[PDB]
Structure 1
Amino acid sequence: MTLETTLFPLEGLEGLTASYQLYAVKGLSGLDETEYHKNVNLLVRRLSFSMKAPFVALSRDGEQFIAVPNYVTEFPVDHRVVRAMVKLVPTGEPLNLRFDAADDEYDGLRLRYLDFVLQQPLFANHHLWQPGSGQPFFHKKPLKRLDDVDLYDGVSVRAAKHPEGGFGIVCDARSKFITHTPIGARADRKRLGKLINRSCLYKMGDHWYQFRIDAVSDWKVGEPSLFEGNVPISLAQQLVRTAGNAAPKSIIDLDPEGGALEYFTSTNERRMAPAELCFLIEDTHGRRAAKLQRQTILSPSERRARVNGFIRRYLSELNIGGAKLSAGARAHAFFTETHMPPALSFGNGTVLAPDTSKDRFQAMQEYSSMRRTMMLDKKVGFFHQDVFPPQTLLLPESVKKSWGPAFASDFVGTVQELYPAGGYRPEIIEYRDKAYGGGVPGQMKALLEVAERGEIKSGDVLVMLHRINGAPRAQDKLAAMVCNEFEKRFGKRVQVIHSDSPGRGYKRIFKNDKPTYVQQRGRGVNIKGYLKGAALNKVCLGNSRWPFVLRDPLNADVTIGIDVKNNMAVFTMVAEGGRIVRVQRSRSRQREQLLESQVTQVITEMLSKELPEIKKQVQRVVIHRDGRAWPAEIAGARKTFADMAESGLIAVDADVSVFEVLKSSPAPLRLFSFEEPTQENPKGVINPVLGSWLKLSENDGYICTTGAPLLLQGTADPLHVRKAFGPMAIEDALKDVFDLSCLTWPKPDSCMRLPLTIKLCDIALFDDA
């Protein structure tokens, strides 16, 4: 019940002052909406990098208004590219924002400035470095040596509004893996080729930063490759030129035969750097580094200790010109009531509700297990129990001629035991997976031709695919295309598994003087666990057979999730208690963004189909965006629902609100709860409990969709949700984000970080055109 944050008070904020000079933009009256605000942002990016100053945008009224700092002087005021031509007229009267006053809309301006000048003392600390601007600050000394790769520890620092008034600082520990020894001067033109688009840390003497390799230079470090005023200069002469004073040996005694890399500046010029001073960033999310990744998951006491360490060590004194700032040593703490999980409804009128008499921790663990065993118990079971429509199972020819039939037999029997009301009985079909190519084209040609033959009766298909490319950072093209084409050209709803995981669960045995396949539990997969999880996720949830739903209404009558990536948008809708769930894909113009009209279209169409089934009149609507919410998207959303209030489809006085769900937060905040100190836990720091929550503002909040009883390792990552519009109190939004995340349908006995709405986007949009 007692919680501590990673938000820290800022003392001495007075005197510190921010002076902007609002402008306004003329450009093109052609406010193409998605194309107007895209250009607003491009200029503020272009201007911030070029003039190295905190330019902000303030979109009130006409959405114009660029804030220029008052210490820059020769301001061009006109700016090319950007298609059309642009002019910035001032809006006069010079601003002088303050950190003691009260909530403005100029507080996005104070926050920009505050973040800009706080990274000035840290940037000039000889023992810290920063890969790039906005990123965390790392110790130059590795925390751990870890054999051929070094583990660096860092702490991110972000200005925030303080809930008890004023301004503070949110912080979080970070980790980074860098190879111990440099690329080297002894690395040839061909090996430096193999390294383009990798990233490396450049130890440019005392100045450390990170860049992305774009090219191998034609010139060695000692040959003339650039020139300062006509005179052709070598890169080695250039670095000696800009070394200062007691320059370290490494940057004034380079091997002249070593190679150089090339890379682009923030403002897009070309620059070189000697390979002798460059250390490859070990992309531990590119290559599977299981032993390494364990080192980056911190226990709550480890995580609190490193964040506070860094605050006490580097932030107790801060000289921003005149001002002398301090970060308080004690982070903001508070008493709160934690949200209890919601009552849920299963089969046979059975309800599951958290016991209020047990202590919270025991109550949460019993409830979360009960979600699984109630689902499995034949006398309670799924909330939605009917017979399945016809089902197809589509297998590679090479699998059907081997372990296929043993797998299918086990899989059906697993479905029948999980979901006995369904009578699962699929028709087993094959496609000629060895006939055309084994790459994405070829597999597709074999799959299509089976569909064109009409061999897929039934509208639901579970298709088993070969994994074309692995590495948990590529993208499953083949699975995406089979869903688009099987749904567009034919009317099919398709789920997907892969051939490798279940293959590893079968071995060939000789029985009754005949070869047959049977299970094995060697290593490669827990095959029994694989069948249960795939039966649930691919067949039951694939057929919209929800195993449990909310007993009691949320604050929103309907709530809608929206994500867009790779020119594929996904809308999802959750109404009644999860009793109504619709997931609808749709192609888009932009890669990650939606046209004002495409929003009004898809949503009116989805909601109108379901409104006859929603027996309470609709009067509170919530949209959950995955990422930033662009105002072309908010407009289409305000539009859609204004209409339906006139047509009488919903209540006349109904209202909408839009919220961003920032699964990767720009201000990562953590929460801690406390315990009896205990030898192994000297300070007694533990995870917060599952329902803990915190409001920093009327527009920013945090909710622990994961937490104490149900986390097996690490420290909980609270979920950041930000209001973008509407009459809905952020506390109310936080409460049903939490209720929506107790619908743990993919793994009932678990916590689940995202609410169901944007959780539905992830699995659906894993398949993007």
Structure 2
Amino acid sequence: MTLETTLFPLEGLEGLTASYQLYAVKGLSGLDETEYHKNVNLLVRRLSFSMKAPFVALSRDGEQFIAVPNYVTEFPVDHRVVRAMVKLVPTGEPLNLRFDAADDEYDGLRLRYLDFVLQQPLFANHHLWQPGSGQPFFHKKPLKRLDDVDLYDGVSVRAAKHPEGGFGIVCDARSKFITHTPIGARADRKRLGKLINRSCLYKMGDHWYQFRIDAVSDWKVGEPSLFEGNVPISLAQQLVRTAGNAAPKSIIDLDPEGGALEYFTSTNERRMAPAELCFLIEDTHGRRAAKLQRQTILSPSERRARVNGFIRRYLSELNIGGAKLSAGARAHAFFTETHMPPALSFGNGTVLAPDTSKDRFQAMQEYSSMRRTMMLDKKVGFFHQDVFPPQTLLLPESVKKSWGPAFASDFVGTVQELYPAGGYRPEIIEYRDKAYGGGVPGQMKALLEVAERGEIKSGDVLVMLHRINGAPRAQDKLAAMVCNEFEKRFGKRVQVIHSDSPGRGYKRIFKNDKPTYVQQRGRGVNIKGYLKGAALNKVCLGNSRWPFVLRDPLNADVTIGIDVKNNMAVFTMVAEGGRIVRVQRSRSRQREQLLESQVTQVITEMLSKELPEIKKQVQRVVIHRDGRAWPAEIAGARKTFADMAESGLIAVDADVSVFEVLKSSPAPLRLFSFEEPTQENPKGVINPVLGSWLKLSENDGYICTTGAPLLLQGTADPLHVRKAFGPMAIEDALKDVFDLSCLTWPKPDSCMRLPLTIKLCDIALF
């Protein structure tokens, strides 16, 4: 019950002046929304870099408001580029922010100043470096060698509210992989062309930083490519002109014939960097280098050790205006009650409840196992049991002619054993996967023409696609294409599997003097496991046959997940206790953001259909956003529900709350609990228990949706949720985030870090 954080308190901030002066930006007041905030955050960075002061943006009312420190002297007030010229009219009332104070709306302002000053000792340490603004600091010396790629260890350091009052520091260990040798001066023009969009570490003498390769320069390092006052100057000459004092040999003795790269500054200037000084960052999720990935998974005691070691070594001294701000040696620790997993309802009126008489750890593991075994027991089974509507299995022709039939036979039987009530009996159809070209167009040509023939009787289809590109850090545009077209022109609900992984499970055999495909089970896939998993996710879940639901009400009557990536939005809606789940995709006019009118359309459309099956009057709605919530999205959700409270579809005093679900947290914190130290674990640090949680603030909490009994390796990564709007108390949102993440439908005997609401969003996009 004893949990330690990676929160370290900050002392000697006791009544420290932080003085600001609000300005407001007239700009180009046309708000393209996504474009409006790119430029806002563009100017704050440009202004911050040029005057070396903590400029911030405060989005309330007009969403402008750049906060200028009172201590800056000359201030341009007018700023060029940015299309139409911008003007900043000061809003008076200079704010002297205290750090001993209660919660303000200027706490975002206070956290930014605190953030800015905290990285000055770090940015000045010659032995550390930072990839870009806002990122962790890494040691210049690599931790580990790993045979042509280097492993660098870093620590993110972010300011945050302390739940006992005042301010503190949250940290986490990070790893970055960089190839050991540079690109090199001798690498030729064609090889350099092949690196566009990759990112490399640039050791520009003592200033190390990261950039993205945008183009290859027409000019080598020693040929004049720009000018320092009219006169043409080589890149080699430029690095000499901007070196200091005892510049390293490496930056003044560059091969004149080496090539140079070009990149854009975080203010969009173009710069060059010599390939002799550039080191490719190894995207290991792009190229499966898993022995590399293994070096990155740290035990809880390693992770704790690296963070505490870092704290005591680099944030020990910090003089800001003389002030002596110490980071305490003791991370914040507290006693808390841990959420028990919720009672669950299965088929045949059977509930699964955590056993409160066994000890917590043994009870959680029995519980987690029982979600699978109850789901599979023909005596209890799925909560929702019914015949499937007609189904279709759409296979490539090359597959129907080889192992398709054995796979389909095995697959149907797997569905019927997992979900006996369904009577899965799919029509098996094919498309001419070799008639048109095997790229995305051509695969799609054959698919549309099967559709156009009307060969997909039935509204549900499971179609087997070929993998076009691998690289798990890619976009499978074929799958999205098939769903967009099959949903939009025909009435199809489509689920996707690929042909490579099941195909590895079958080998051809000669039996009774006839070729046959039979399962194999050496190395490559576990075909039985694949068959069970695909049966649950593609057939059962794809027909909304939920295996189990919450027995008890969440704090919210309805929670809606929202993710938008790559101009495609997903809305999931969970009501009852997961008894009612709906997922709508919709195209988006911006890459990662939604128009207000679009939010209000999709949600009233989705909810209106479902309201007659929500048999309790609705009075709490929650929205879970993946990442940042945008003001136009909030307006659409408050408008949607204020409307329904007036129609009578919902309680006249219903309320909305908006929470950002930060699967990639901007302020990542760890939680540990403790154990007897034991040879193998000299400090006795273990993962936190499954339901552990911590709030820092009314707006910021963390729940271990993953944790002690149920993790295989590594240390639990607490899910950061941040309150964007609304009455609901942050503690309540964390509790039913936890309860929603116990609906582990894609893999019941496992833990699941995301609540079901936004997990369904990642599934629908991925």
Give the TM-score range, shorter chain: over 0.9
Q: 1:36 to 1:229 in 2, by over 3 A?
A: closer
The superposition leaves residues 94-150 of structure 1 with CA deviations (integer Å, 9 ceiling, x where unpaired) of 323222222222221111111111111111111111111211111111111111111
Is the 8 Å Cα contact of residues 49 and 267 (structure 1) preserved in structure 2? no
The Cα shift of 1:87 comes to 2.5
Deviates more, 1:226-235 or 1:182-191: 226-235
Is the 8 Å Cα contact of residues 49 and 266 (structure 1) preserved in structure 2? no
Is the 8 Å Cα contact of residues 342 and 354 (structure 1) preserved in structure 2? yes
The Cα shift of 1:599 comes to 1.1
The Cα shift of 1:27 comes to 4.5
Is the 8 Å Cα contact of residues 121 and 320 (structure 1) preserved in structure 2? no
Deviates more, 1:93-102 or 1:404-413: 93-102
The Cα shift of 1:85 comes to 4.8
The Cα shift of 1:641 comes to 1.1
Is the 8 Å Cα contact of residues 9 and 169 (structure 1) preserved in structure 2? yes
Deviates more, 1:429-438 or 1:84-93: 84-93
The superposition leaves residues 731-751 of structure 1 with CA deviations (integer Å, 9 ceiling, x where unpaired) of 110000000000001110000
The Cα shift of 1:401 comes to 0.5
Whole-angstrom distance in 1 between the partners of 2:127 and 2:330: 24
Match of 2:664 in 1: 664
Q: 1:592 to 1:535 in 2, by over 3 A?
A: same
Is the 8 Å Cα contact of residues 678 and 684 (structure 1) preserved in structure 2? yes
Match of 2:512 in 1: 512
Q: 1:266 to 1:64 in 2, by over 3 A?
A: closer
The Cα shift of 1:54 comes to 1.9
Whole-angstrom distance in 1 between the partners of 2:424 and 2:198: 48
The superposition leaves residues 259-308 of structure 1 with CA deviations (integer Å, 9 ceiling, x where unpaired) of 22222222222222222222211121221111001111111000000000
Is the 8 Å Cα contact of residues 22 and 67 (structure 2) preserved in structure 1? yes
Whole-angstrom distance in 2 between the partners of 1:32 and 1:286: 33
The superposition leaves residues 338-397 of structure 1 with CA deviations (integer Å, 9 ceiling, x where unpaired) of 000000011111110000000000000000000000011110011110111100111101
2:752 is the counterpart of 1:756: no
Whole-angstrom distance in 2 between the partners of 1:230 and 1:163: 58
Matches within 5 A, 1:264-663: 264-663=264-663
The Cα shift of 1:258 comes to 2.1
Match of 1:158 in 2: 158
Is the 8 Å Cα contact of residues 183 and 276 (structure 1) preserved in structure 2? yes
Deviates more, 1:631-640 or 1:660-669: 631-640
Deviates more, 1:189-198 or 1:5-14: 189-198
2:85 is the counterpart of 1:85: yes
Q: Secondary structure at the match of 2:424?
A: coil
Deviates more, 1:74-83 or 1:578-587: 74-83
Deviates more, 1:659-668 or 1:637-646: 637-646
The Cα shift of 1:31 comes to 6.2
The Cα shift of 1:191 comes to 1.9
Unaligned runs of 5+ in 1: none
Is the 8 Å Cα contact of residues 15 and 323 (structure 1) preserved in structure 2? no
Whole-angstrom distance in 2 between the partners of 1:82 and 1:229: 25
Q: Secondary structure at the match of 2:502?
A: helix
The Cα shift of 1:520 comes to 0.6
Q: 1:576 to 1:22 in 2, by over 3 A?
A: same
Is the 8 Å Cα contact of residues 348 and 379 (structure 2) preserved in structure 1? yes
The Cα shift of 1:189 comes to 2.1
Whole-angstrom distance in 2 between the partners of 1:735 and 1:259: 56
Whole-angstrom distance in 2 between the partners of 1:340 and 1:590: 40
Deviates more, 1:383-392 or 1:231-240: 231-240
The Cα shift of 1:47 comes to 3.4
The Cα shift of 1:34 comes to 6.6
2:170 is the counterpart of 1:170: yes
Q: Secondary structure at the match of 1:458?
A: coil
Is the 8 Å Cα contact of residues 19 and 97 (structure 1) preserved in structure 2? yes
The Cα shift of 1:631 comes to 1.3
Whole-angstrom distance in 2 between the partners of 1:10 and 1:136: 19
Whole-angstrom distance in 2 between the partners of 1:240 and 1:25: 39
Give the number of equivalent residue pairs.
766
Is the 8 Å Cα contact of residues 48 and 55 (structure 1) preserved in structure 2? yes
Is the 8 Å Cα contact of residues 34 and 595 (structure 1) preserved in structure 2? no
Is the 8 Å Cα contact of residues 240 and 251 (structure 1) preserved in structure 2? yes
Deviates more, 1:504-513 or 1:275-284: 275-284
Deviates more, 1:434-443 or 1:279-288: 279-288
Is the 8 Å Cα contact of residues 699 and 723 (structure 1) preserved in structure 2? yes
Whole-angstrom distance in 2 between the partners of 1:29 and 1:445: 45
Deviates more, 1:585-594 or 1:742-751: 585-594
Whole-angstrom distance in 2 between the partners of 1:358 and 1:441: 58
Match of 2:712 in 1: 712
Whole-angstrom distance in 2 between the partners of 1:553 and 1:227: 69
Q: 1:128 to 1:16 in 2, by over 3 A?
A: farther
Whole-angstrom distance in 1 between the partners of 2:24 and 2:240: 44
Q: 1:644 to 1:7 in 2, by over 3 A?
A: same
The superposition leaves residues 43-101 of structure 1 with CA deviations (integer Å, 9 ceiling, x where unpaired) of 43453345443221223344342212233333232345555553221122332322222
Deviates more, 1:593-602 or 1:681-690: 593-602
Whole-angstrom distance in 2 between the partners of 1:200 and 1:86: 34
If the length of structure 2 is used for normalisation, what is the TM-score? 0.97
The Cα shift of 1:204 comes to 1.8
Is the 8 Å Cα contact of residues 558 and 622 (structure 1) preserved in structure 2? yes
Deviates more, 1:263-272 or 1:665-674: 263-272
The Cα shift of 1:255 comes to 2.4
Is the 8 Å Cα contact of residues 28 and 83 (structure 2) preserved in structure 1? no
The Cα shift of 1:760 comes to 1.1
Q: Secondary structure at the match of 1:652?
A: coil
The Cα shift of 1:20 comes to 1.6
Q: Secondary structure at the match of 1:190?
A: helix
Q: Secondary structure at the match of 2:373?
A: helix
Whole-angstrom distance in 1 between the partners of 2:210 and 2:761: 33
The Cα shift of 1:32 comes to 7.1
The superposition leaves residues 296-347 of structure 1 with CA deviations (integer Å, 9 ceiling, x where unpaired) of 1111000000000000111111233422322111100000000000000111
The superposition leaves residues 223-259 of structure 1 with CA deviations (integer Å, 9 ceiling, x where unpaired) of 3333322333333333233322232222232222222
The superposition leaves residues 494-518 of structure 1 with CA deviations (integer Å, 9 ceiling, x where unpaired) of 1111011011111111111111111
Whole-angstrom distance in 1 between the partners of 2:448 and 2:736: 42
Is the 8 Å Cα contact of residues 42 and 267 (structure 2) preserved in structure 1? no
Q: Secondary structure at the match of 2:190?
A: helix
The superposition leaves residues 180-222 of structure 1 with CA deviations (integer Å, 9 ceiling, x where unpaired) of 1112222222222222222211222222111222222233323
Is the 8 Å Cα contact of residues 507 and 520 (structure 1) preserved in structure 2? yes
Q: 1:224 to 1:65 in 2, by over 3 A?
A: closer
If the length of structure 1 is used for normalisation, what is the TM-score? 0.97
Whole-angstrom distance in 1 between the partners of 2:749 and 2:196: 44
Q: Secondary structure at the match of 2:181?
A: coil
Match of 1:212 in 2: 212
Whole-angstrom distance in 2 between the partners of 1:20 and 1:625: 31
Whole-angstrom distance in 1 between the partners of 2:40 and 2:186: 47
Whole-angstrom distance in 2 between the partners of 1:490 and 1:399: 24
Q: Secondary structure at the match of 1:121?
A: helix
The Cα shift of 1:40 comes to 4.4
Whole-angstrom distance in 2 between the partners of 1:229 and 1:152: 40
Whole-angstrom distance in 1 between the partners of 2:32 and 2:206: 47
Q: 1:35 to 1:470 in 2, by over 3 A?
A: closer
The Cα shift of 1:583 comes to 0.6
Deviates more, 1:275-284 or 1:307-316: 275-284
Is the 8 Å Cα contact of residues 15 and 100 (structure 2) preserved in structure 1? no
Q: Secondary structure at the match of 1:305?
A: helix
Whole-angstrom distance in 2 between the partners of 1:693 and 1:398: 51
Whole-angstrom distance in 2 between the partners of 1:318 and 1:135: 19
Is the 8 Å Cα contact of residues 120 and 320 (structure 1) preserved in structure 2? no
Query: What RMSD over aligned residues (CA atoms) do the two structures have, in Å?
Result: 1.7
Whole-angstrom distance in 2 between the partners of 1:549 and 1:340: 16
Whole-angstrom distance in 2 between the partners of 1:244 and 1:448: 64
Q: 1:677 to 1:460 in 2, by over 3 A?
A: same
Q: Secondary structure at the match of 1:122?
A: helix
Whole-angstrom distance in 2 between the partners of 1:275 and 1:32: 38
The Cα shift of 1:19 comes to 2.1
The superposition leaves residues 430-480 of structure 1 with CA deviations (integer Å, 9 ceiling, x where unpaired) of 111000010110011101111111111000000000001000111011111
Is the 8 Å Cα contact of residues 151 and 177 (structure 1) preserved in structure 2? yes
Is the 8 Å Cα contact of residues 387 and 423 (structure 1) preserved in structure 2? yes
Q: 1:695 to 1:366 in 2, by over 3 A?
A: same
The superposition leaves residues 565-593 of structure 1 with CA deviations (integer Å, 9 ceiling, x where unpaired) of 12211111100111111111112211111
The Cα shift of 1:167 comes to 0.9
